Amino acid sequence: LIVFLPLLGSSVAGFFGRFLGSEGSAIMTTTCVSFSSILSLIAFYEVALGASACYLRIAPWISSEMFDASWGFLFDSLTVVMLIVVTSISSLVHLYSISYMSEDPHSPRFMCYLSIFTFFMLMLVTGDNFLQLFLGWEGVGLASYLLIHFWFTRLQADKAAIKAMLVNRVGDFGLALGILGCFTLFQTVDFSTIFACASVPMRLNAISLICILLFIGAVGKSAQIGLHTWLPDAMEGPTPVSALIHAATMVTAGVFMIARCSPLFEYSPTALIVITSAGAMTSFLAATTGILQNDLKRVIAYSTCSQLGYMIFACGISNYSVSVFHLMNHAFFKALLFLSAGSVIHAMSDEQDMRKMGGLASSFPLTYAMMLIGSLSLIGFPFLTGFYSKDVILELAYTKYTISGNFAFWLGSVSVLFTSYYSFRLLFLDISRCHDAPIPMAIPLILLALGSNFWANSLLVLPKNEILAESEFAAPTIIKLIPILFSTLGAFVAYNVNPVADQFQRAFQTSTFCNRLYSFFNKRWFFDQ
């Protein structure tokens, strides 16, 4: 047993937390009032970070008849990778919770749900065949819900979150219909040779529709623009909770499936172009309509939408490994700035004033100060990103233009304009202490700022597979210079006092003020009403 550790922690904290006491690990029970905490889950959990590649084998699970027992995973170029990433994320969120928790008496049950979220995400990232994957896949939908309404302060928030979770559910059924069609066609579970099986052969253009149904699932579990289940709701719940959903179960779990099924999107190029179309359109539209949002918390999600649309596009352009490494690094950075958001919301929990353009960027903590680092090294500058995981595949999108022939999308498929614009839209826009980032809160931010090459260089460890021949390409190299200046525009333009072009506030020519997308792109994206 190496994976079920957070499940064990959750199962013990679910009941023993309110009947055990001071220590509750093995002895010293209710010597004082419980004050029990995540302490058990942490002391049991932190070991899994030592995962390193050496052949490991399988273990029984639900021994259905058509299916197989002896489930698990065998070691390849993604298993321990995703394992260490997700356990790092979960440890992050657990420490940040025990910081941000201990005031709401539903805390024990909450962090229980948190580890159940982690365990469903595990059963995703550790399933040998996609049936355990679907187990964990609706597990993380239910877990996103169970994590949404912990704070529970407002009820109509949930009265909207129900129609929200409709979309989590329909995505999980996208996956269910997909896997049903798989076993109607494949008859098997093993991912190795199913590529050879389905690569040769209702509508009778079935297999392509299968892959697209898998895509529909990967997106319906997500929350980006029109499939957004968690945007209008998730921030009333604790900040590391929205961090968890947006990082892991929005996209990471959605795409770890299609990456375990990377050969299954390989065998259908029609499927690949349908992924690329929707991915590029989602990135483009999220970043584009992401104009003038006014808040102090939700703008991280207002970024995540496009910052992951581009990445699902990366998965769909046949650069699955590239999108994977992009997602590890983006999880890191976006989690750093999620925890920055949580720090400043705890600041709002210590006082209720907006500061005068000097305190909107720092209350003078060094522990939290790494918010600038996280943001700017996320934005797509050649520090460790930009050409890395974004612009090299955009140099591939140049050739995608060369193929398709529309000189609109992949020219501006980089959204550094929009990303940089609303980034600063967040960076800008009763006395409290100069010590406002607690230590048990900030140690996670410290180690994850530390977190920021043999994966970023993918054509080395996995060089020149059959059709995985991509990267440098017959490309014009002008993109090694051009989008840096879109980045620089989005960097310096926002340094004014009025970033919005004047007369954008009132609409143009005085038509109906409802036709602007504000009421549209917050509630289910309301595109075709």
């Binding site: 047993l1 064990l8 013990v12 058990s40």
Partner: peptide
């Protein structure tokens, strides 16, 4: 269930040898 987690760890070593 700390020491109970250690008992589950004994069972885990058993199942690992079963995978070994």
């Amino acid at each position: 269930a700390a020491a109970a987690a250690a008992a589950a760890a004994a069972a885990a070593a058993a199942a690992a040898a079963a995978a070994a």
